[PDB]
Design a protein around this ligand. Structure first.
Ligand code: NAD
Ligand code: NAD
Ligand code: NAD
Ligand code: UGA
Ligand code: UGA
Ligand code: UGA
Ligand code: CL
Ligand code: CL
Ligand code: CL
Ligand code: CL
Lengths: 461, 461, 460
């Protein structure tokens, strides 16, 4: 049996940093080196202020960093020395060319594959952790086959990642499962078993699934598409509730008590964000179109279409409720991160609601407890319109001071705890609360007594 | 019988220069003066370097120029002195206004008609050689009727041109036929017969067709639409072949051995280019829409739609074969002219394939034995993107050095003769050849043995 | 080199019968046995009146029948003895299920395949003679592979038919080309070569083209599609001519003089008919949809849509000319066959023009010199035939009391009619609608007699 003793991870992002940090923490005898082309990111990983906010992450980094955990921009030597190389780079939707707005952008992956074969000799396992179109591993194999050297044996595995931001460390330390894909050849199964032996330092063997390479790639896309679909489905139900007097939280509970459906991922929202759900479903759609599966393509597209309807109609709700015009109206945006317990804003609904209201010429005042203000400025920029229409607030009370509406977009715990009596006093009248997260449930009577018009998703006005 | 002794041709382009050069060469007693508003074009026609590359043209110009062949920017005196005035100006698709992207732009023609009546006295024959919408001659007539002078007799004829670039001189010296259109009046038939007498110096009378003005105008559009259609039809068959394992060259041969179909214009390609096929079919389409013939309009539109599918899918082939990403990938473009034996690039498929690959951020290195590099730069410009993504190569080996793919777009003879063993050595791996012209047929086994992945149109991978 | 000396042909129809008769006639040293399940058809091939009428066929058949040409219902013995087995059965359009109206039905081909493998030992060459969908040869190979025996070697070839109706024997004796497809293996190439040697008894080697099997199958459909496309293209041009003062006959001459275009199949018409063109183009379109080639499917669909528009617009011209009402108006239809010199009416434009006028309540009087009146009744049946349709014994009957004379088939006799006689007994205004451009050159005098003359691709 081959033993992995040095690991290199190309990509020091929300996946690469935490995954490697937990591997190093659980496997004291394995050297783990996380690398990136981004110098300031790598410099931040080596500093008292990590480049990402993830609960418990700093404690894990600090326990291992400089012992068996390293962050470096020296990609070549980290590859050269490694028994195992992870590819954990970004795979965004292409914003250009063929498949613009749908297809996965594989240029970061290809760059990794080229760099690996350029800097590799002997035996190495190359593990595709990035979320990819099905069969992407076949292209990494072809590049390696076409660029062999004497004694160079590069084995390719699929090892997709299931962590959610905000709960990364817990997800990594106690995963529901680990999935590994490789071919059925003797060398392929040897590679699989070596990677399994890494995870077995802390994951029970019954929680490690081994499949073929393509089932593993597909499983990741499917898992994300099923999760996103649960949200779009309950969000579709929120609209029906609003029209009927049914309550979406009541309905969610009823359906989720069926053990075959389950009670998770039935929290209605202004819409799902985060870097991957939309892009991974669109990748699935694009791939289906390419494989002449248009029925399957249009089935999954509904998940994205619903999410976009949820958001748009939430924005329309705000504008319709505020007498059909929001031009020059101060509006508080409470929450800019895509979910609580992260500073990540990638595809946050907060961005889409903010842009909709900015198209109207609203004056947005934006508060979030963890997102840096510079990121919010970048997200809302194409910027003159940002300088004219957007203010980043230091606290929520400042945001709401002289506002017409408070719009809650991220389910930070603090928001339900605010002093709404104080807030109502300095708001323009009538004062509105638009709750995109159902976090103010149970406060509606008190809020109404104070004087607010309170509206939320999945509840009839 | 009236005898034409002085000819003026307005338009010194790919039609006007060669047609007039051959008339002068065949009719030593007729003074032929080619005129243009473009000074540098006219200056080039008077120089050792003609403004166009056409086989055998220089020999014809040089034998007559300064004897009975003249090139001049003095349009007014050339008209004033002429027995016969040719209109041989450009008729591009309108890029603006009503019919943008479809309708013919008749502003150059109208300018000629106005200038002719302004500078004409006595008897002259005015011959519309430019490709025009049907009934355009009626407008030239109306302008003349509305601007008569005492003793001014301007007779209007249709005399469209059937030469193909690359074979212009041969086509002009030995035409399959000459077509002349005029009205059935005594003066009209007199004009027709005078123009016939010019061509009879070298074209047998049985190869000179005389029709009415509108049949003649329409015949030119129809002829071009039938030719373009043969190519789009065999290109449509190329796609079916790729899907079935049939070979398009085999199928082309089988169908073309039916004497009713004929064996010409069945060469599959990345797509037909050249200045006229697309614009003349679109003119036909537009005209049909204007005459309430939408069924006829949509029949002919298929010829353009097929051509655009052929090109797009060829580009998609390249990107799909190169692991679904070509960003930063060096790619050799061999051939930029729209067909071999011309330096003309007007509507070359090379432009469309290059632009598709540039949209992806590919690094194109472009070689062509006759197109000037300045023209390729203009064609690919909207240019920063050109400065970043495009290099004009001095030879094909330079183009292919460190390239991922060689893409053949123009059927220059030299390309099949290249040293592909040498080329494979310095290509990045795996190395691809994409043959848009079927010029490497028969070399596939040798190329595969060298190591290439070779793909071509109308052949299954 | 392998010599073929016994040929069996499964299917004694319009393709198989004549093809095999010519082979026997040209190759005296080959025994050619044509077989069929249809016993009365086989018995007719051995009779003084053959079950297929083609000029020259009777003479070819009678020259070698009983010598080296045989017709039999004994299919199993013919297969068993054959070096080469032609599959020349019909592949009719599916009238049901997947591909209804467009897909070819392969049931007969498959039956033959199963029967061949069942009755075969050793080496045989099996050749698709009938028009088939692309990759039909692969199904035959699979049936053979699944049903193999020791020493069984069945090589599958494609060898399409290019017979035009009424000229089959001349097409057979002097073909533009012979097309043979086989795979590019040693065995497939010896099979191809063995069949080439048969055709070489009368076809120059330069006119025999050998391809792969799929190329061969696809070439037959593409050929008919290119042919039908020339007709739809010149017809589309005919409509523009009428709108612009151009003449489609002048335009056809002008474009046909380009040797890259050529001068055949540019005769504008009310629309192409026949049992082949629409069927083969629709099959091609269905194959494209099945292969996920939608751009290609709708490119070729235009050939059919243009043909259908040519017929539709011609009927509407008739109706609009007769003041937009033809209820109980007598109209003479001259020509019902799909082209001249035949009684064949299959997919004839005359059917479609007649049905359009029937839908308006017109009283049609139909004359054709060769189409049997019984066929006309069937073709115009689904009620309205007995009510609206009369089959005339001569053109003058048909035109008597008529509002319009409509020429749908290009029979040479129609330009020889006594149009002064016709005009006298027609209701006024009297119309002639020439759907075939047969009365060109009578236009001046017909106008003087007093007709309103309407033709395709010209305003007279
Ligand atoms: N973020 C999540 O919650 C999550 C969860 C599961 C899976 N994933 C998948 O993991 C992958 C990475 O996600 P992420 O959120 O960490 O992205 P990220 O953008 O935050 O990090 C990727 C890093 O890779 C670097 N990189 C790109 N190309 C490089 C190259 N050629 N050489 C060296 N470094 C390079 C970038 O600079 C960046 O720092 C994606 O494919 C994603 O779909 C993400
Ligand atoms: N290029 C061919 O292979 C070809 C073949 C047959 C027919 N045609 C037809 O011939 C016509 C000309 O084609 P081309 O390729 O020679 O175009 P071109 O652009 O190369 O040449 C036309 C010339 O006319 C000049 N011109 C325009 N307006 C003028 C004016 N008012 N006074 C004086 N000069 C003027 C332009 O400066 C230009 O030099 C077109 O209508 C085209 O459809 C072209
Ligand atoms: O082509 P075409 O236009 O010549 O077709 P066609 O209809 O003129 O003739 C095809 C012939 O094939 C025969 N046939 C069909 N299946 C058969 C089978 N399994 N065994 C024997 N004969 C069979 C039919 O009886 C028919 O006579
Ligand atoms: O591939 C990925 O990137 C990851 O995507 C998600 O993780 P993540 O996007 O970080 O966070 P989630 O908790 O799944 O929520 C995504 C979006 O759905 C929203 N959401 C979630 C659950 C819910 O019930 N309702 C709802 O609106 C969240 O607020 C957020 O905007 C998946 O949960 C992970 O398993 C996966 O590894
Ligand atoms: O009006 C015009 O401008 C002229 O257009 C064409 O001439 P041209 O465009 O110069 O050259 P072609 O040989 O017709 O080819 C046009 C395009 O079709 C492509 N082509 C041609 C033939 C073929 O079989 N396959 C094919 O892809 C050529 O490479 C080229 O891109 C016609 O051939 C001329 O008769 C006509 O006078
Ligand atoms: O697939 C087949 O078995 C045969 O189909 C057709 O033969 P066919 O339909 O009998 O006769 P055609 O001469 O092609 O005429 C078909 C239709 O086209 C019409 N047509 C033909 C030529 C033309 O210029 N204009 C025109 O309207 C004819 O009047 C007729 O309605 C082909 O011509 C044969 O090569 C082929 O072998
Ligand atoms: Cl695998
Ligand atoms: Cl909080
Ligand atoms: Cl005229
Ligand atoms: Cl060359």
């Amino acid at each position: 049996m081959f033993e992995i003793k040095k690991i290199c991870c190309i990509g020091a992002g929300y996946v690469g940093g935490p995954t490697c940090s937990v591997i190093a923490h659980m496997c004291p005898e394995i050297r783990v080196t996380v690398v990136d082309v981004n110098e300031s990111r790598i410099n931040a990983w080596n500093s008292p202020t990590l480049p990402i906010y993830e609960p418990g992450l700093k404690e894990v980094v600090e326990s291992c960093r400089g012992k068996n955990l390293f962050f470096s921009t020296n990609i070549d030597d980290a590859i050269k020395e490694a028994d195992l190389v992870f590819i954990s780079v970004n795979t965004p939707t292409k914003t250009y060319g063929m498949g613009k707005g749908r297809a996965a952008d594989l240029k970061y992956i290809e760059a990794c594959a080229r760099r690996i074969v350029q800097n590799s000799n002997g035996y190495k396992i190359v593990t595709e952790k990035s979320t990819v179109p099905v069969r992407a591993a076949e292209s990494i194999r072809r590049i390696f086959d076409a660029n062999t050297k004497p004694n160079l044996n590069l084995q390719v595995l699929s090892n997709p990642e299931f962590l959610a931001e905000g709960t990364a460390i817990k997800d990594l330390k106690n995963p529901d499962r680990v999935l590994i894909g490789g071919d059925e050849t003797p060398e392929g199964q040897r590679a699989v078993q070596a990677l399994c032996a890494v995870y077995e330092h802390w994951v029970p063997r019954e929680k490690i699934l081994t499949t073929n390479t393509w089932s593993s790639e597909l499983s990741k896309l499917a898992a994300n598409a099923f999760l996103a679909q649960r949200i779009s489905s309950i969000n579709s139900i929120s609209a029906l509730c609003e029209a009927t007097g049914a309550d979406v939280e009541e309905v969610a509970t009823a359906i989720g008590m069926d053990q075959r459906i389950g009670n998770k991922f039935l929290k209605a929202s202004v819409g799902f964000g985060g870097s991957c759900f939309q892009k991974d479903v669109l990748n699935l759609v694009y791939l289906c179109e390419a494989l002449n599966l248009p029925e399957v393509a249009r089935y999954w597209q509904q998940v994205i279409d619903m999410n976009d309807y949820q958001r748009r109609r939430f924005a329309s709700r705000i504008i319709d409720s505020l007498f059909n015009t929001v031009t020059d109206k101060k509006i508080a945006i409470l929450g800019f991160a895509f979910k609580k317990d992260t500073g990540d804003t990638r595809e946050s609904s907060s961005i889409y609601i903010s842009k909709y209201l900015m198209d109207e010429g609203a004056h947005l005042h934006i508060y979030d407890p963890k997102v840096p203000r510079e990121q919010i400025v970048v997200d809302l920029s194409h910027d003159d319109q940002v300088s004219r229409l957007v203010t980043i607030s230091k606290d929520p009370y400042e945001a709401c001071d002289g506002a017409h509406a408070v719009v809650i977009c991220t389910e930070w715990d603090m928001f339900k705890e605010l002093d709404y009596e104080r807030i109502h006093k300095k708001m323009l009248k009538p004062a509105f609360i638009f709750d995109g997260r159902r976090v103010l449930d149970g406060l509606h009577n008190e809020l109404q007594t104070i004087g607010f018009q309170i509206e939320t998703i999945g509840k009839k006005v």
